[PDB]
């Protein structure tokens, strides 16, 4: 039982740290998405609408 | 007198036949019950700490 508990603890901690890693990556990723979207005029919105 | 001696003999025979085996059976049952109780208590403790961990 102690071995199983340690296994669960360590695997869960590792996967939670991995979730945090993608979290930080995705946040720093979306910041630049917003920054790029800020420089969109009517032509770009028209392109997005006609692509969708 | 034949039957009186038979009474004494059958008294002793009934003793040796059922009175002492009853006591031995009682001792066996209580010993085995002690063993089973200790086993169940230990298993329950193991399961409880399993659940806790």
From Swiss-Prot, chain A:
Q: What is this protein called?
A: Flotillin-1
Q: How does it assemble?
A: Heterooligomeric complex of flotillin-1 and flotillin-2 and caveolin-1 and caveolin-2. Interacts with ECPAS.
State the source organism's domain of life.
Eukaryota
Its taxonomic placement starts with: Eukaryota, Metazoa, Chordata, Craniata, Vertebrata
Protein family per UniProt: Belongs to the band 7/mec-2 family. Flotillin subfamily.
Q: Which organism is it from?
A: Homo sapiens
The protein's location, in the record's own words, is: Cell membrane; Endosome; Membrane, Caveola; Melanosome
Query: What is known about what this protein does?
Result: May act as a scaffolding protein within caveolar membranes, functionally participating in formation of caveolae or caveolae-like vesicles.
UniProtKB/Swiss-Prot annotation, chain B:
Compartments annotated for it: namely: Cell membrane; Membrane, Caveola; Endosome; Membrane
- Recount the PTM note: ZDHHC5-catalyzed palmitoylation may be required for the formation of higher-order complexes and for neurite outgrowth in cultured neural stem cells.
Tissues expressing this chain? In skin, expressed in epidermis and epidermal appendages but not in dermis. Expressed in all layers of the epidermis except the basal layer. In hair follicles, expressed in the suprabasal layer but not the basal layer. Also expressed in melanoma and carcinoma cell lines, fibroblasts and foreskin melanocytes.
What does the UniProt function comment say about this protein? May act as a scaffolding protein within caveolar membranes, functionally participating in formation of caveolae or caveolae-like vesicles. May be involved in epidermal cell adhesion and epidermal structure and function.
Q: Which family does it belong to?
A: Belongs to the band 7/mec-2 family. Flotillin subfamily.
Complex and partners = Heterooligomeric complex of flotillin-1 and flotillin-2 and caveolin-1 and caveolin-2. Interacts with ECPAS.
- Tell me what this protein is called: Flotillin-2
Q: Which organism is it from?
A: Homo sapiens (Human)
Q: What part of the entire protein does this chain span? A: 269 to 321 of 428
